[PDB]
Design a protein around this ligand. Structure first.
Ligand SMILES: Cc1cc2nc3c(=O)[nH]c(=O)nc-3n(C[C@H](O)[C@H](O)[C@H](O)COP(=O)(O)O)c2cc1C
Ligand SMILES: Cc1cc2nc3c(=O)[nH]c(=O)nc-3n(C[C@H](O)[C@H](O)[C@H](O)COP(=O)(O)O)c2cc1C
Ligand SMILES: O=C(O)c1cc2ccccc2s1
Ligand SMILES: O=C(O)c1cc2ccccc2s1
Ligand SMILES: [K+]
Ligand SMILES: [K+]
Ligand SMILES: [K+]
Ligand SMILES: [K+]
Ligand SMILES: [Mn+2]
Ligand SMILES: [Mn+2]
Lengths: 497, 497
């Protein structure tokens, strides 16, 4: 067999064939060693590690693939791992990847297809046969408060009324032989659905957690598609094909038929347990910072022969928390702005900002037709984005004109640094939901869950009126075309590299 | 031969021997072509171009050296051109370069030595023999308002009372056969001295402009050493050697004996002329933005046989306006903070900020002993720096703790983005002098000369009280030493690059 974007096992074979995989066949410790290798890969844009020989693997549970959505070293196929999630050429641009992820937003869903069985049913362990403390669950960072089984699997929960089935990534660690704890926080759809079940008050939330799902499905899992939209049908429209799902053995939820590993059970509407600390997307761990988290009960495990667990070793640049959380939030913000009649062409979360900023490219011809001002426009953009779930993780919005490529962090930083006057050209937002994981929020001087957001206007004054009134002092813009070409043509003949 | 740091001709020979020079012996047009080559060099960190065959060179005036203080491609000798200005090993760090530049601040000056002649007297042209419009003065950017003869020479002016002789770089372009116009703006020492002569009211300011001066002298020329300090004696203390100067033929100022090209004349206390626009340090030109500038009268030219004019093709990253203006301002800010009993260890202007920010590394053990708060400390740091001339060009100060290397822009951006809460952790400064060259100032929404400055506190709350309370989620900090070394030792054996 099945295509790489629809089958995780086929995706691993695609990374091998690409020479974008290192298969490590010698024993590797899930206590820190796997994650240390993976962390070094992410910090150096090396090949994805596949740990085929994990110390503690029992009865086919489990191998690990690290860095499944991290960057490649070359600029030509920098985003090729992400392209392999989506059936795009490995040379795809970030604009092409985000346009692919947005393509289903104005298509009819393609609902999933139920099939009677699949590879995820090759093996099973009941409530008397598994112990989550006896599996080779990784310790990802030396001060983590638990072994984080869940960094790149898909939580599956459904609204009490059955009308909305949500797929999302949210971290979880092993609590004991048959429980996890994890983050379930507003405004995330796992939390929205949990609240629906708690207000109904009758039972715990039927749940499954599927690891090594179809790559196109883990991308949508990481994307803030709208409230009430079933990710399975959005992935179906995006890929042009209905995803094959099989029913859980112990509940009526459906999981991707080729899922490497499936946990079945319940998310409690009443119990909590110690969760964290964890080395998180902004690059930090606060040792001993244990909080209470959601508590999951595991009733059954099913899995593929020779099952592979994907793992994100997240932290400092560059991993899946940057390449997928940032970029997919920026894509949904682009679309949200356009649907609110704001003249935004492109959005990207600069890696240099630890994906806490989103740069918004403005169609300044349209802006001019609005006959508005910086203060009015900044206000309007912030109100749209910072009061919506798609803006949750983003604390700074940078507005830039048509000359800036928002996918080039150097050009965003240049525009921000030179065209936005601190204070005057900015609007602060203190009455919007804040992202507490950002250290200046949850470990900062102010309310952990509120405010700390800013719109920074890097549009220049004439971009609102008559048009750009500068040329860059760069090779591209400060020299005529014929001269530039002469210089490029004579470069090596003159003696340069 | 004489040493490279004391003689420009020896510095050019040192870049050749380093394989850090390309000698272009075929004809090159000073109308845009030289500067286009130079701009491409600066944008790619290539070798410095020496144009030995400039279209329009007459009677030894002149060759051009581009990119004299720009970066090299390698990380190992990135700052080697700057090190060659100062007799430092080409592998010198930015900390070592800035410590060299600061070393004279607590030494007695070594006053200069007068010698009866030198190479700068090999040739001369009087008021009837030269025409500045007939020399091969470069057009640096296609929309410049003039041919900018002066980007990397040294203006020499003296206080009416003779007690202070200032050396500085300030741009100037050709106005007519025997005049320049240029920028003379507060709070710059050329402007401070001009004001002393205008209030005396008796005559125009005796002036000289020396090109291809001793490299150690052009570095101090670019540095905001204190008011009333004669740069010649500071360079003498920094180098351990008294600089040799010769008297001007038409006035009583003294110029470096090995100066490649010397203009002698007067800076008018009454006349102005059209100056600019110019492709400037932040990366911009505003075409047709002509202002009035200072007007210089040229009475005489003296020059070396086969004279070389240094040229900065300034604009977008990376050139002398970044590597010298930013870094030398940051060095003087470091020292100014320490002299005000602020616990600052290091300062650097991140290139990513277009050198509009300075990152200040804090000794947080000392900070803890201060028993202060973010708001109080931010206020104190901003008042010291933004009310001093050394802070003029800098619009944002970022305070960072002991774990950040301020010389690594990636680490500054990470700290800024994750540890400074927008608004709450910042103090805006609207009643301080602003730098109008920054587009958001002079071409922005607010007063061109006032405010727009900010102190951004990227210290975390516990850094003021009990100590850092996090570990980075990175390879260095989230894995024990023995594991890290094992991973590095096995890296290639496992299959990585
Ligand atoms: C590696 C990785 C780790 C993630 N960890 C979390 C987490 O612990 N909690 C969370 O709410 N979101 C986490 N996310 C982000 C969510 O997947 C993202 O916000 C998504 O929009 C959630 O789906 P929803 O829109 O259906 O709620 C993570 C994403 C990735 C790629
Ligand atoms: C390539 C280059 C161009 C410069 N252009 C100017 C300019 O046009 N005007 C100016 O006031 N300073 C300019 N400077 C900066 C000053 O040299 C710097 O602010 C220095 O501190 C001035 O000397 P002073 O402290 O003796 O006034 C330039 C520096 C460099 C390296
Ligand atoms: O542990 C982590 O890195 C993260 C936790 C969360 C919570 C919400 C959205 C993104 C993330 S990323
Ligand atoms: O033309 C330019 O790039 C510059 C003008 C000025 C004025 C003052 C300080 C630095 C600079 S840099
Ligand atoms: K989702
Ligand atoms: K602006
Ligand atoms: K100076
Ligand atoms: K702070
Ligand atoms: Mn959802
Ligand atoms: Mn001075």
């Amino acid at each position: 067999a099945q295509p790489a974007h629809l089958c995780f096992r086929s995706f691993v074979e695609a990374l091998k064939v690409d020479n974008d995989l290192v298969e490590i066949n010698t024993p590797i410790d899930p206590n820190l060693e796997a994650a240390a290798i993976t962390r070094r890969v992410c910090e150096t844009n090396d090949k994805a590690p596949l740990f085929n020989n994990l110390i503690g693997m029992k009865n086919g549970l489990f191998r690990i693939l690290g860095a499944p959505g991290s960057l490649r070293k070359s600029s030509a196929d920098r985003y090729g791992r992400l392209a392999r999630h989506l059936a795009l050429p490995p040379t795809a641009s970030m604009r092409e990847i985000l346009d692919k992820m947005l393509s289903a937003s104005d298509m009819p869903p393609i609902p999933p297809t139920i099939v009677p069985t699949g590879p995820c049913k090759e093996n099973s362990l009941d409530d008397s046969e598994f112990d989550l403390t006896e599996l080779p669950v990784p310790l990802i960072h030396k001060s983590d408060g638990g072994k984080y089984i869940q960094t790149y699997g898909m939580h599956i929960v459904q609204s009490p009324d059955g009308t909305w089935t949500n797929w999302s990534i949210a971290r979880a660690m092993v609590h004991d032989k048959n429980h996890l704890t994890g983050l379930v926080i507003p405004p995330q759809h796992i939390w929205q659905i949990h609240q629906m079940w708690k207000k109904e008050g009758r039972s715990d939330v039927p749940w499954a957690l599927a690891f090594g799902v179809p790559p196109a499905a883990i991308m949508a899992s990481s994307m803030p598609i709208p409230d009430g939209v079933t990710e399975a049908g959005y992935v179906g429209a995006m890929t042009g094909s209905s995803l094959e799902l099989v029913k859980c053995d112990t509940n009526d939820l459906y999981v991707p038929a080729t899922s490497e590993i499936v946990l079945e059970g319940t998310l409690s509407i009443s119990e909590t347990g110690p969760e964290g600390p964890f080395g998180e997307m902004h690059g930090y761990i606060f040792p001993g910072d244990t909080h209470l988290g959601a508590k999951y009960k595991v009733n059954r495990i099913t899995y593929r022969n020779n099952a592979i667990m994907p793992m994100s070793s997240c932290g400092r640049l560059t991993d899946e928390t940057h390449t997928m959380i940032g970029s997919l939030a920026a894509a949904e913000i682009r679309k949200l702005c356009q649907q609110n009649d704001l003249p935004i062409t492109d959005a990207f979360a600069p890696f240099e900002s630890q994906v806490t900023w989103v740069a918004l490219r403005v169609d300044t011809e349209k802006l001019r037709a609005m006959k508005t001002t910086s203060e009015g426009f900044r206000k309007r953009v912030g109100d749209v984005v910072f009061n919506h779930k798609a803006g949750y993780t983003i604390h700074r919005l940078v507005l830039v004109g048509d000359d800036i490529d928002v996918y080039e962090g150097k050009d965003v930083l240049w525009a921000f640094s030179t065209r936005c006057r601190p204070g005057m050209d900015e609007t602060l937002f203190e009455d919007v939901r804040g992202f507490p994981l950002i250290p200046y929020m949850g470990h900062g001087n102010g309310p952990a869950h509120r405010g700390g957001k800013v719109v920074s206007d890097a549009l220049m004054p004439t971009e609102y009126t008559t048009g750009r009134n500068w040329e860059a002092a760069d090779f591209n813009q400060s020299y005529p075309e014929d001269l530039k070409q002469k210089v490029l043509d004579n470069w090596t003949k003159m003696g340069f590299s």
